[PDB]
Design a protein around this ligand. Structure first.
Ligand SMILES: C[S@@+](CCC(N)C(=O)[O-])C[C@@H]1OC(n2cnc3c(N)ncnc32)C(O)[C@@H]1O
Length: 371
């Protein structure tokens, strides 16, 4: 059992297969949540699957959250959670039947249980829930949508890019109830599928969603959504769903808005609405800068890219399109400059190193990239 530090938190992690899971590479993902929570200010928050407890501990130490819940089904994780919490906080941790509570400046609740059972007990209780599972979050989604306030925030992660990026089509249909698209656009389609499944599951509770921030990074998808209260809110949310058509011979895509597609070879359903709230993401860049984070340089690099990134469905991948059409292409920076000079919005995208988001028609893009 060695000690490590992440952000303002110091935790004990076992040494190697490990009894309690901890991934230092996820320090960035945790930094982004911290930044967002300092903008939204949720009071009651839940770290549904905390393992070592690092996420919830940082929520308590680095954000305005007043009541923080840490939960894990593993006995080992639970014991480690209590230890690391008391490693960062003073006081006596009162425990009773797989539940330990500390009532200090911040109220910390440590629970040993199935996330679905805990969330079912806390109906319409949390202002913010963070679902960070090992793989798919689908077995916890429906209950999280009932555990969060009707105007709460949901932070969702999916680490199984295989089905979301199209490698495992069958699994994607089973888990996400959507037809995935392979290729250069898969990182974004996977992200829009995640957001779209959250929107679809939310509808039955007469709730809609506004995406605060949804992105892809190092083989995992993240979606922060704000629940909207009302049947009409839910109707308008479903109206933002749609499908994608992809011509594998050219890289040209088409979009169809609607609950159901009306042509063959449709991919989706996917969320065709905004993948970010401009104002909030803009504020996150500033907030990240004024905060001490675990991976501050990587967090700013990602947030700045997303901040300047055009918020529009899909993009054109210079490399992939070049390979499909069998043509030579210009460099990305040369293409963006050329597109802007012609009056079209054009930016790079975090979804791909060679991707370009632009309002320009496919044909205009092709004429511009042709070298
Ligand atoms: C990759 S880890 C989570 C990490 C994290 N939240 C962070 O930033 O370190 C997911 C894990 O979820 C678990 N788990 C699996 N099923 C669960 C369930 N039904 N309820 C609560 N926890 C569960 C674990 O035992 C384990 O600690």
């Amino acid at each position: 059992l060695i000690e490590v530090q992440e952000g303002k938190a110091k935790i004990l992690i076992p040494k190697a297969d490990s009894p309690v899971f901890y991934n230092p590479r996820m320090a960035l993902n945790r930094d982004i949540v911290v930044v967002l929570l300092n903008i939204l200010n949720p009071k009651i928050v839940l770290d549904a699957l905390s393992a070592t407890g690092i996420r919830g501990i940082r929520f308590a130490l680095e954000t305005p959250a007043e009541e923080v819940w840490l939960n894990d089904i593993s006995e080992d994780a639970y014991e480690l959670m209590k230890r690391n919490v008391m490693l960062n906080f003073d006081g006596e941790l009162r425990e009773s039947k797989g539940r330990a509570i500390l009532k200090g400046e911040k109220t910390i609740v440590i629970n040993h249980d199935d996330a679905n059972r805990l969330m079912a007990e806390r109906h319409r209780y949390f202002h913010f829930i963070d679902l960070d599972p090992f793989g798919s979050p689908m077995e916890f989604l429906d209950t999280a949508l009932r555990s969060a306030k009707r105007r709460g925030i949901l932070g969702v992660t999916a680490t199984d890019g295989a089905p979301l990026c199209g490698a495992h089509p069958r699994a994607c249909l089973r888990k996400y109830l959507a037809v995935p698209l392979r290729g250069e656009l898969c990182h974004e389609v996977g992200t829009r599928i995640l957001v779209g499944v959250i929107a679809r599951y939310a509808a039955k509770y007469d709730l809609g969603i506004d995406v605060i921030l949804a992105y892809y990074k190092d083989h995992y998808f993240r979606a922060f959504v704000k629940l909207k209260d009302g049947a009409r809110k839910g109707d308008e949310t479903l109206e933002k769903l749609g499908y994608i058509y992809f011509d594998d011979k050219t890289g040209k895509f088409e979009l169809e808005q609607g609950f159901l597609p009306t042509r063959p070879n449709a991919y989706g359903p996917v969320w065709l609405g905004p993948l970010k709230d401009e104002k909030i993401v803009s504020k996150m860049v500033k907030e990240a800068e004024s905060l001490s984070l675990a991976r501050k340089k990587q967090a700013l690099k990602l947030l700045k890219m997303i901040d300047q990134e055009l918020d529009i469905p899909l993009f054109y991948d210079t490399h992939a399109i070049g390979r499909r059409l069998k043509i030579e292409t210009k460099k990305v920076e040369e293409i963006i400059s050329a597109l802007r000079e012609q009056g079209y919005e054009a930016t790079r995208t975090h979804f791909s190193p060679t991707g370009i988001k632009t309002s320009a028609p496919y044909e205009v893009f092709i004429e511009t990239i042709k070298r």
